[model samples]
Target: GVPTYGAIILDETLENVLLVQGYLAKSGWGFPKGKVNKEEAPHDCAAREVFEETGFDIKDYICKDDYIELRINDQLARLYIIPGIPKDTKFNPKTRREIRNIEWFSIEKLPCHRNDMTPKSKLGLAPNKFFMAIPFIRPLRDWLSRRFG
Candidate 1:
């Protein structure tokens, strides 16, 4: 059976997205994600994973009705889009171990650097390697800009 995981596409300003740089056991950055615990809702899992991986709490973020799914080799992954961050949401800096850094990036331009305060491309999953990646990097950027810019 395919193991299941939940990921969150977290947006703060609606024009920028949140991402974390992975370290140690987890290398390469992607949306904050993890295995779903038994009896836990996927959305809840997504939020929990995001909180654990990054310092931001997205428990109250707006969740999209639709989700993006990918068949990632041995497991099936589901990604949810959570629009906007809460005003009180601040990076706690104590909940993460696998993530070395966290930052917000312009939807259109993500950097590759590992330690920059702003999100980098090296920390982002390329469109070719991730499901619905192009939308977040390009079209989604345009769409969000038009809708919220």
Candidate 2:
């Protein structure tokens, strides 16, 4: 069985979300995520990884009491949704060796495409197995809005 990883969604605004590119991203971008350390719970791991990769303390921003499980390829991931980040926060990945870039994209601007060879289709890196989670984004956003907004 593949080890489970924890990830977090950081939304700066109701319509904008934070994205990061890891070492393996190529040209793709993804949310802040990582493997859960021994003895660490999924939510705690998500918070820790998000802070380490984005320089934002999302411990308080996390809106979910539990996590949503996503199976991408061989990886089983637990993802948490963070309502928003502090406006004054900066982008600084504590784990620089593993991350290459960080940026924010409007929800409407999320890079998505139907053709597998298209650039946008290859831009979403987190759970980056052929954009498997793209279908989840809308519902997740709506879920967060109703629960936290």
Candidate 3:
């Protein structure tokens, strides 16, 4: 497996509650994420990738320490969370130097069925393994919301 990368537990406000997206994927809908340079930490890299891909600036404190490291086809990955970001920001799809077909969907009402994951679902670990290297995003989200809000 590769050494380290970055990931996200992205949440945006819709109406008021946080929303998640499930793009048309083999698995289904999920959050936005990417990898960081060797010099980057999960916090900085997650925010950077979100802006680069989504065109929205990641506000402070909204992102939590949410990450998951699992083997996909035996490749190592890392993901985490970010907080205090604006929900109304729009996205401009990057031209697929990495991924394509980016859009903003209501996190509360995602466009997929049960068992449907994210287009990037292939990256998730076995859910049970709870990959240790990866940060626990949702749990961290709760923590951030409590402390920051």
The lDDT for every candidate, in the order shown, is: 0.57, 0.64, 0.45
TM-score of 3: 0.44
Whole-model lDDT for model 2 versus the true structure? 0.64
lDDT of 3 by residue, 1-149 (tens): 44344434344442122222323341222345565577776667766765565555554643454445545667655554443345554565353453444443343343222332466666543342112312333444444567565
What shift in Å separates residue 133 of candidate 1 from its native position after superposition? 6.9
lDDT minimum window of 10 residues, candidate 1? 127-136
TM-score for all models, in order of appearance: 0.62, 0.71, 0.44
Candidate 3 lDDT score at position 136: 35
The candidate that achieves the highest lDDT relative to the unseen native structure: 2
TM-score of 2: 0.71
lDDT by residue for model 2 over 1-149, one digit each (tens)? 44444444555566766777776543456666777777887667787888788877667766566456666677777667665665455789887887788776666656443345345666533444325335446666666667777
**Cα displacement (Å) at residue 89, model 3:** 1.7
